[PDB]
Amino acid sequence: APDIPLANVKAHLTQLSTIAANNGGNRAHGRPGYKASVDYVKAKLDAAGYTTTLQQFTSGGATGYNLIANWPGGDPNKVLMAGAHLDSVSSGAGINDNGSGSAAVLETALAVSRAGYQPDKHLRFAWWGAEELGLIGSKFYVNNLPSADRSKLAGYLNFDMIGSPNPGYFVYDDDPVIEKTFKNYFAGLNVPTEIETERSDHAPFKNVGVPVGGLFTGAGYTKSAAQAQKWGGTAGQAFDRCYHSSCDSLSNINDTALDRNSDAAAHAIWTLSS
Ligand SMILES: [Ca+2]
Ligand SMILES: [Zn+2]
Ligand SMILES: [Zn+2]
């Protein structure tokens, strides 16, 4: 797998920040900042050769959208998917929650095209709308997939908050194989990981039997002294002091955590699609 360039991931975050500033300060469902975010991500994917689909749904009286991107080729009967929600709450730009996951998945998709990668399994990436209203977009996607297509899913990897300013490195403890894949990558960097315990888009998939996994760097919970010992940062302070707040801006990102988790996302996607 390629090393994902941190500068490219940060460039997507800068674009999402500008989009929020030009649209009222947020990228929330039913507000113009959300569709403008979908348009930026879709244009990058279309230029890289993906087949993109906009899925529309209505929630709370407003139109929301999921963006699905398929990389042509691979085994149509074994699909590996990775996703991240693209909406923010209305109080701010949602740069760590969840511009961080959205940008990492987008740069991983672009890396597949730049590398000329031809996976054994078919790759599909998704950016979900309305996660902050109760996983509405990912529930819409799973509820609308015919059982024949659901059975072709080999796994779903979720990235929601991966650049927290006072980070922890948490790996989901769902499918054992996906979990091991992420844990082995962090072991190679000598960065310890803990099981995720602190409610995101992998839930609809998990509920119907699709293997799931993912990464998380923490939100409102307080980092303990033992955790500050193994990862640095500040004990006694939240992992993300700007969770769902107006200060979840470009300055609410820890570059090391964002780089590590973006590289881990690419490693898992390359490993599991072989
Ligand atoms: Ca990197
Ligand atoms: Zn989130
Ligand atoms: Zn959130």
Distant-in-sequence contacts of 51-59, Cβ < 8 A, 24+ apart: 55/137, 55/140, 55/141, 55/144, 57/129, 57/130, 57/136, 57/137, 57/140, 59/29, 59/130, 59/133, 59/136
List alpha helices for the chain, DSSP H.
6-22, 32-47, 100-115, 136-144, 147-150, 176-189, 202-207, 225-231, 255-272
Technique that determined the structure: X-ray
Whose CA is closest to 124, among 42, 84, 68, 74?
Answer: 68
Resolution (Å units): 1.6
Query: Which letter does DSSP use for residue 248 in this model?
Result: -
| Sign of the torsion angle spanned by Cα atoms 54, 150, 58, 89 | negative
Would you say 55 and 66 are in contact if contact means Cβ atoms under 8 Å apart?
A: yes
Ligand closest to the CA atom of residue 244: 3
Q: What angle do CA 257, 259, 264 make, to 5 degrees?
A: 95
Q: Which tokens belong to 94?
A: 């949602």
Asked if residues 243 and 163 have their Cβ atoms less than 8 Å apart, the reply is no
Instruction: Give the integer Cα–Cα distance in Å for 132 and 219.
Output: 14
Residue entry with tokens 């230029």 = 47
**Phi and psi for 202 in degrees, rounded to 5?**
-75, -15
Catalytic residues: 131
Residues annotated as binding site for Ca(2+)?
Answer: 3-4, 259, 263
Can you tell me whether residue 76 is helix, strand or coil?
strand
Which DSSP state fits 85?
E
Ligand at minimal distance from the CA of 243 is 3
Q: Distance between CA atoms of 212 and 110, rounded to whole angstroms?
A: 22
Q: Which residues surround ligand 1, an ion (CB under 5 A)?
A: 3-4, 259, 263
Query: According to the 3-state scheme, what is the secondary structure of 102-145?
Result: HHHHHHHHHHHHHHCCCCCEEEEEEEECCHHHCCHHHHHHHHHC
Instruction: Please state, in angstroms and rounded to a whole number, the distance separating the CA atoms of residues 67 and 125.
Output: 8
Cα dihedral value 206, 209, 211, 216, nearest 10: 0
DSSP at 218 = -
* Residues whose beta carbons lie less than 5 angstroms from ion ligand 2: 97-98, 160
HSE-up of 124 (CA within 13 Å, CB side)?
A: 23
Chain breaks in the chain (C to N over 2.5 A) after: 198
Residue 74 is classified by DSSP as: S
Tokens of 273: 């699609």
Domains in the chain (CATH in brackets) are 1-274 (3.40.630.10)
| Binding-site annotation: residue ranges | 3-4, 85, 97, 132, 160, 244, 259, 263
Q: Going by DSSP bridges, is the β-strand pair 170-171/153-159 parallel, antiparallel, or unpaired?
A: unpaired
Instruction: Say how many C-beta atoms besides its own lie within 10 A of residue 215's C-beta.
Output: 28
- Residue burial 249-263, b: 16+ Cβ < 10 Å; e: rest: bbebbbeebbbbbbb
Instruction: Provide the terminal-to-terminal Cα distance of the chain, rounded to the nearest Å.
Output: 11
Ligand closest to CA 1? 1
Which one-letter amino acid corresponds to residue 266? A
Q: Strand pairing of 212-216 and 170-171?
A: antiparallel
